[PDB]
Ligand binder design. Structure first.
Ligand SMILES: CCCCCCCCCCCCC/C=C/[C@H](O)[C@H](N)CO
Ligand SMILES: CCCCCCCCCCCCC/C=C/[C@H](O)[C@H](N)CO
Lengths: 59, 285, 238, 251, 285, 238, 59, 60, 59
């Protein structure tokens, strides 16, 4: 029946849930809360020549 | 048929154990003039123990940061009046009149998403010397008009036929109405800031009001009733979902002035203290 | 029909729920996605960008650029402290309107290490050394170079590389501290002292300035969203 | 490590005291491709006649200077064939290489911030008023910030601490930027791709980005050193494209 | 058991790259007298670049164009009156009284579909000098009568037994009633235009009213109540589904006159302008 | 029964929803389907059919066939412009009541290329050449053949083939333009000029007419349905 | 259980939905919104002899 | 929609029921579990610990 | 559909139930009533040297 089973948010130191889509448009679907990606170098390291961080910056 | 989908949680980096050092590697010396932010950790500068860090950056993602309902408009309208225009409410759609949602959205230059729209409607018996009646439950009609549609003139205008415009009918005492709206803009994304004009001779309308153009909302009572006057209030709430944003910006410092412009009054950078060395004493008998 | 039974919570409107809902525009065809530069995926990405700190926030300078400049000069000034402030990244006036503080003020809990970068903007002929120290909480703030010498510190030597980084490491008994910090979740203080002094040749200015940037490290995170106290209105249309 | 050369068209820039180069968001300029295009006519690509360095007018950095800004495009609408192509077409697209120059001796001191701001919408110094086009830009001449609050009709509120936009100026580091520290380097270089929410746009109606130059540490010197210290800007467009040829417009 | 169904989206054609040309092929020269529309593209007449077009013609299909609820009738009826016929409402079914849905359907000569019918019912306390009472919630009955059925005479007629006619009973305060109706016509399709007569001697009734014959609707209050007078309004909404249409026609230019005929007043082709060369100046300082 | 909980949106009537519903006629037996000629599957199919344009919509001709005829004649008339109009397929009086404009007025957004066909209805002994030009927006409309010469144009030679097609290609910064066009979504103009002139022999009329048809190309589409402003009523039974 | 799983409408540059029929008559089913076919030549090219479009129409 | 019918017990609040309920804090990230000594799993465990009895419970 | 079937509480001297999770957070799940473990020696026998209970405690 086109069900999806995925894991729930838990802690660290029976845990999954099921979902069905009812509507014909994807703009009716619930929010996408479980996607956690990053790419910080876009803003923190926007330079042409790579800087090693153990070497001096200049010279 | 069942289909398993695996979710990857992204926790933060551990700290590695580090001992004494005496070498030519200088992690602490940098040069900000390059435009580069230093990627040093405590393990480069002190001696550290090994820690297994289990914390997650889940609640600071854009989707979790933005997916919460917020009020964007409030309006009132009466069941009976002698003005003929106080019997229905109407406005132009945007998210610029309530400062919290506006400032939150304005950390980014461009945004794109779908919306979930909720309405909250309440009523009240107008103050008077003669009170007391027996009214049936009130019903409300909400109609959305894209640009170019015919505009209602009164509460009995033919335009409330809503043959092609989407409308909601609702009765008091039930759960609040709701519907979802897709990403509707002639561009590839919504624009929060526009440094340009509407006319090719560099004049006319400046800035945001050139690009939005997303129709109007009209709301009326359906009963056409009330021997004694009554007032209703409608409030609109927005929640974005399936979000993408581009080009972060510094957050707003000055207080907002109007909904058409970015105009402001000059404000200080922060608040003052006694001295550049001042720090209060907190360990005293 | 199928027999059912309604539970507590029916017919309410929770502003943080996540349900499916009917579309008022069936089969609408959206504009294709364009690949614009600069896509943001996490708010922490903004928090790891350096931004200038208004350390000199005294009376008479709140609306001028001098609020960003820390003054130093030549001569015998070893007894004079250069600067000092509390480590309260979301509450103290020094930090609350920087990028990191602005992000923190949307949240209630924070955790992680902090980076402070210091840049020297004197002439190419000035030399000197400074001591940058950080003291964990439990005692009052040091009143001399000798006391501050006992904490976590770095000795910065001004040279062709113009910038030094002092890292404040996460030393805490709890996993998280409150953004609205109190006595219980305090974190200590930072101070600066002259290690040797500023020496210059003839024909050069004798006074100079230092600037300070703040950012967050790669072990940093926040939680418990809330509304910010920095924006407000009295009525609609604002 | 500190020497650099940049060649574009028939123009070349050398420098001996540079820091590095900033690629705005890790994205180099490039032409529009087929699965992202909407306009149907075949475009023109002049390719050496437009993609070359143009030098604007200089400003004088004095002991009390609040700062300067320019708007792009419309600072290059009178620069040769780039400007001529701008006049005759409806749609244009281009990235840029920006280079800022300021040299001084080892006995001077000062610190400048050089920042590029996309969609820098500005506010009026009358709260219930609006700006004129002249107040936003004077072509190849720079506009000037103030050190106090401003008055006047149709003019931009230009006190330097709010940067004309209602933010804290010390946060402008979220944008692509470099610093010129007089003891360290003598030039800044920023490479900026095309950044918009549509694949092409009209070059007269819309300012794509603003270049801001703000001294954080004022210029200072001693007894008989040189007093005159100028700053110079030089910009070169890259991957320039035009669509919609008709008769030339007039402002 | 699950069964996968694959949906094919149909996007528009790309434009191909084209260069200079000097030949005898003349794509631009045609002859309209043949009744043929030229299939030329920009690539035949100018130089073009290659574009990958992703747009879809999804919202201009007939099903998406027609599947939206539209009002087709409104009527009123009282709880108490001295006329005996103002206590119930009744009408003959068609889609010819509200102009929007009518004009939309009339772009095609023949149509065939199923329907989804919704009713919206509201009530109100009649104006008077003495107000105030305690009534229970009102209930409404809607009965459909195919042609040849017995007709009610009053609100207590035996015919409201509805032994074989389908009826709906409804109470105020609940969601609006709804039901679906199949394609019911003695022909193979519904006819929107009929250029003929009802009698074999070429006289009698002309045009549309010869062929429709699809029964009547009657609506009454059930309580039989109201010490003080009250009024109710019923509105009907139609939505077609599983649609097919044939033989497109030019859209209606003149305004409608009545529901039985195509009669009209002569109207202009469009509105005027100053000159055959006139075009306004918009690029001025 | 099964425990459930109602969400916002319950018990409303949205006029564009799509749900299942009970039949008031169980097991009804419908009339078999007949294969009638001329079945329509998409509204765009109607938009690709040519229809005549009322170019000569001046005062005194709004109710006559002369509204469709563009006049031309022999002699030296090179300085006189033949016609010109804006490209606003859903708003301008010239285009709003043609088949294409009628279809567009049910929608809010349009995109694609447009075809204009021109037919010459003079005697078989008349010869001549015309210049048909289209100017994208950004400048004022040309006032002479020399200025219009710089845009997108075609030179039409009257001969045994009586019809020439000028294609207006989609040149725009956005993917879609508004059916209710404003300064921001403008699209330019079309103009016509004498390239050589009309020459005739003795015994032939000296004045003639040209007609113009409009249709949509195979890259054309619309979206965002709305009600049309061309039909109205004051009360029921109309 | 006679379920149908089909793809949702999305854009270009987890996406399917499930449906069950409850009623005995097909006139009770929801609308058929995801069928996009065309045959424009029926109205634009209704001629007996094919016209090539690169060749002259007559002669 | 799907036809249903409500049974007795709808819309009541029983203080010993066990149902699912929506979270007012979506995707909250909890503090990791620490292994503290002395975890209790059953109340009977407390009942098997000896305790002193007040046998001499007379006046005064 | 990610269902779980487990046994019901009965007596001693057709008995199982099914459950589906609907929400994305595990803090929304129902109570965990069917876990019965013990470790009483933590409180009743917290001594270093083991005491046999048939032998005298001391000596
Ligand atoms: C029958 C009730 C229908 C309710 C109609 C609500 C439609 C609201 C207009 C849709 C567009 C809203 C999406 C967000 C608009 C702006 O782009 C954002 N606030 C940021 O720019
Ligand atoms: C108990 C409530 C029952 C409601 C009865 C509603 C039945 C309506 C009559 C069915 C026929 C309507 C189908 C459309 C009729 C015309 O053919 C079209 N308007 C176009 O000709």
């Amino acid at each position: 029946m086109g069900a999806q089973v995925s894991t729930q948010k838990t802690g660290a130191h029976i845990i999954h849930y099921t979902n069905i889509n009812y509507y014909k448009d994807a703009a009716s679907n619930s929010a996408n809360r479980q996607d956690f990606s990053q790419d910080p170098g876009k803003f923190t390291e926007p330079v042409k020549d790579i800087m090693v961080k153990s070497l001096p910056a200049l010279n | 048929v069942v289909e398993a989908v695996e979710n990857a949680v992204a926790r933060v980096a551990d700290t590695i154990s580090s001992g004494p050092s005496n070498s030519q590697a200088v992690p602490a010396l940098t040069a900000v003039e390059t435009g580069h932010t230093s990627q040093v950790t405590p393990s480069d500068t002190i001696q550290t123990r090994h820690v297994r860090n289990y914390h997650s950056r889940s609640e600071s993602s854009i989707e979790n940061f933005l997916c919460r309902s917020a009020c964007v408009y409030m309006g009132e309208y009466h069941t009976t009046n002698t003005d003929t225009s106080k019997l229905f409410a109407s406005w132009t759609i945007n998210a610029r009149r309530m400062v919290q949602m506006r400032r939150k959205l304005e950390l980014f230059t461009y945004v794109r998403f779908d919306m979930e729209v909720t309405f909250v409607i309440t009523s009240k018996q107008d103050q008077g010397t003669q009170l007391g009646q027996d009214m049936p439950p009130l019903t409300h009609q909400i109609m959305y008009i894209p640009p170019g549609g015919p505009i209602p003139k009164s509460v009995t205008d033919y335009t409330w036929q809503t043959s092609t415009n989407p409308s909601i009918f609702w009765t008091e005492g039930n759960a609040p109405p709701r519907m979802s709206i897709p990403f509707i803009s002639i561009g590839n994304a919504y624009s929060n800031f526009y440094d340009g004009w509407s006319h090719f001779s560099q004049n006319g309308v400046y800035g945001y009001n050139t690009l939005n153009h997303m129709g109007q909302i009209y709301v009326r009572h359906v009963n056409g009733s009330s021997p004694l006057p009554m007032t209703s209030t409608v409030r609109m709430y927005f929640k974005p979902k399936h979000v993408k944003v581009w080009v972060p910006r510094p957050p707003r410092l000055c207080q907002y002035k109007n909904a058409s412009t970015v105009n402001f009054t000059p404000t200080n950078i922060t608040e003052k203290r006694q001295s550049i060395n001042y720090i209060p004493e907190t360990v005293k008998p | 029909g199928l027999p059912v039974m309604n539970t507590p919570g029916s017919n309410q409107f929770l502003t943080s729920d996540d349900f499916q809902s009917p579309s008022a525009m069936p089969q609408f065809d959206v504009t294709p996605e364009l690949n614009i530069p600069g896509e943001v995926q996490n708010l922490m990405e903004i928090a790891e960008v350096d931004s200038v700190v208004p350390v000199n926030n005294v009376e008479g300078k709140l609306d001028t650029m001098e609020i960003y400049r820390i003054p130093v000069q030549s001569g015998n000034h070893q007894s004079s402290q250069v600067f000092g402030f509390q480590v309260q990244p979301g509450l103290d006036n020094v930090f609350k309107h920087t990028l990191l503080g602005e992000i923190l003020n949307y949240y209630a809990h924070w955790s992680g290490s902090i980076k402070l970068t210091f840049v020297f903007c004197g002439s190419a002929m000035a030399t000197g050394k400074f001591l940058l120290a950080y003291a964990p909480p439990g005692a009052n703030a040091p009143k001399s170079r000798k006391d501050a010498m006992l904490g976590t510190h770095i000795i910065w030597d001004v040279g062709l590389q113009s910038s030094c980084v002092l890292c404040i490491p996460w030393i805490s008994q709890t996993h998280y501290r409150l953004v609205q910090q109190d006595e219980y979740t305090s974190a200590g203080n930072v101070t600066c002292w002259y290690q040797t002094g500023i020496v210059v040749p003839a024909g050069t200015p004798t006074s100079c300035s230092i600037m300070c940037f703040v950012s967050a490290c790669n072990d940093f995170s926040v939680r418990l969203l809330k509304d910010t106290p920095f924006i407000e209105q009295s009525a609609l249309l604002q | 490590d500190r020497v650099r050369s940049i060649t574009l068209g028939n123009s070349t820039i050398t420098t001996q005291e540079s820091a590095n180069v900033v690629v705005a968001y890790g994205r180099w300029p490039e032409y529009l491709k087929d699965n992202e295009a909407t306009a149907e006519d075949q475009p023109t690509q002049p390719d050496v006649a437009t993609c070359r360095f143009y030098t604007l007018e200089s400003v004088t950095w004095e002991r009390d200077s609040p700062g300067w800004w320019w708007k792009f495009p419309d600072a290059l609408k009178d620069m040769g064939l780039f400007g001529q192509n701008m006049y005759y077409h409806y749609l244009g697209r281009a990235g840029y290489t920006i280079h800022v120059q300021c040299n001084a001796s080892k006995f001077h001191q000062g610190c400048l911030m050089v920042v590029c701001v996309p969609e820098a919408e500005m506010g009026c110094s009358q709260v219930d008023g609006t700006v004129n086009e002249h107040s936003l830009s004077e072509g190849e001449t720079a506009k000037k910030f103030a050190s106090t609050s401003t008055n006047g009709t149709n003019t931009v509120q230009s006190i330097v601490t709010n940067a004309g936009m209602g933010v804290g100026v010390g946060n402008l580091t979220i944008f692509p930027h470099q610093w010129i520290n007089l003891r360290t380097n003598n030039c800044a270089t920023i490479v900026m791709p095309y950044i918009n929410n549509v694949p092409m746009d009209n070059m007269f109606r819309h300012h794509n980005f603003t270049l801001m130059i703000i001294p954080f540490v004022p210029l200072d010197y001693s007894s008989d050193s040189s007093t005159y210290v100028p700053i110079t800007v030089t910009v070169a467009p890259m991957c320039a494209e035009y669509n919609g040829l008709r008769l030339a417009t007039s402002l």
